[PDB]
Amino acid sequence: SMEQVAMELRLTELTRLLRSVLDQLQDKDPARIFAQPVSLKEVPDYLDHIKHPMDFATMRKRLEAQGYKNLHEFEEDFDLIIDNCMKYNARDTVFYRAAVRLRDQGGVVLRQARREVDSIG
C-alpha cells in the first residue's frame, strides 16, 4: 500500500535522525569505553551480574536494520549502557566515571532529539 510506504519513509527518516543522535552520543565517549560489548572471554562472570548487556556497536547494528520504532526504544538501550556500567563498576573507577560523564553530556543531545522527533512527527 501507499500507507505502508509512507510509514516506511517515516521509519527511514527516524533512523536518519537516530544515526546523528548516536554519533553525537558516541563522541561523548572519547576513550571508547562503551564502543563494544564487554568481552565474556575477559569478564567471564559478566552475565551473572548484568542481564541485558549493551554497547554502541550493538545499538548501531539495531539502528541500521531500522530496529528502533521510536526514540524511547533508542533511549532504553542508551540507558542500559550507562546503568550496566554504574552497577558492575565501583564509584572510584574510570569506567563508572566515564558513564556518569556520558549520561550528563548525552542528556543535552537527547533533550533536543525529543523536541525534533515530536516537531517533525
DSSP conformation letters of 64-113 = HTT--SSHHHHHHHHHHHHHHHHHHS-TTSHHHHHHHHHHHHHHHHHHHH
State the method: X-ray
CA 18 to chain centre: 9
Number of Cα atoms under 13 Å in the Cβ half of residue 29: 23
* Preceding-residue numbers of gaps in the chain (C–N over 2.5 Å): none
Q: Please, are residues 55 and 36 in contact by the beta-carbon 8 Å criterion?
A: yes
Of the candidates 62, 86, 81, which has an alpha carbon nearest to the alpha carbon of residue 14? 62
Q: Which CATH architecture fits 1-121?
A: Up-down Bundle (1.20)
C-alpha cell at 31: 576513550
* Whole-number Å distance between alpha carbons of 17 and 35: 20
* Whole-number Å distance between alpha carbons of 22 and 27: 9
Q: Please, are residues 94 and 77 in contact by the beta-carbon 8 Å criterion?
A: no
Please list, in sequence order, all residues whose beta carbon lies within 8 angstroms of the beta carbon of residue 46, skipping any fewer than 6 positions away: 38, 40, 53, 88
Query: What number of other Cβ atoms are within 10 A of residue 18's Cβ?
Result: 22
* Whole-number Å distance between alpha carbons of 121 and 99: 30
* Whole-number Å distance between alpha carbons of 25 and 55: 12
DSSP 8-class letter at 55: -
Q: Please, are residues 35 and 108 in contact by the beta-carbon 8 Å criterion?
A: no
